[PDB]
């Protein structure tokens, strides 16, 4: 649900879409997430490893 469970309602949202909002929050356009979603996911999975 992203940040919405903190505000109280716990609104579900697809993970790739909330990550796209995180990108807007850092000042990167959300198309950068969807156009590079495979790379971003690979980078995240590698970093957790």
């Amino acid at each position: 649900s992203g940040w919405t469970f903190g505000a109280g309602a716990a609104l579900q949202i697809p993970f790739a879409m909330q990550m796209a909002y995180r990108f807007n929050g850092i000042g990167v356009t959300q198309n950068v997430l969807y156009e590079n979603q495979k790379l971003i996911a690979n980078q995240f999975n590698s970093a957790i490893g």
């Binding site: 697809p14 790739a16 969807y34 156009e35 979603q37």
Partner: peptide, 21 residues
Amino acid sequence: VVIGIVNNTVYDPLQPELDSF
């Protein structure tokens, strides 16, 4: 490239004006 994209019409407010013109 976008995963999960969908097809829909996107309205363009300039088109009906030029059409009427």
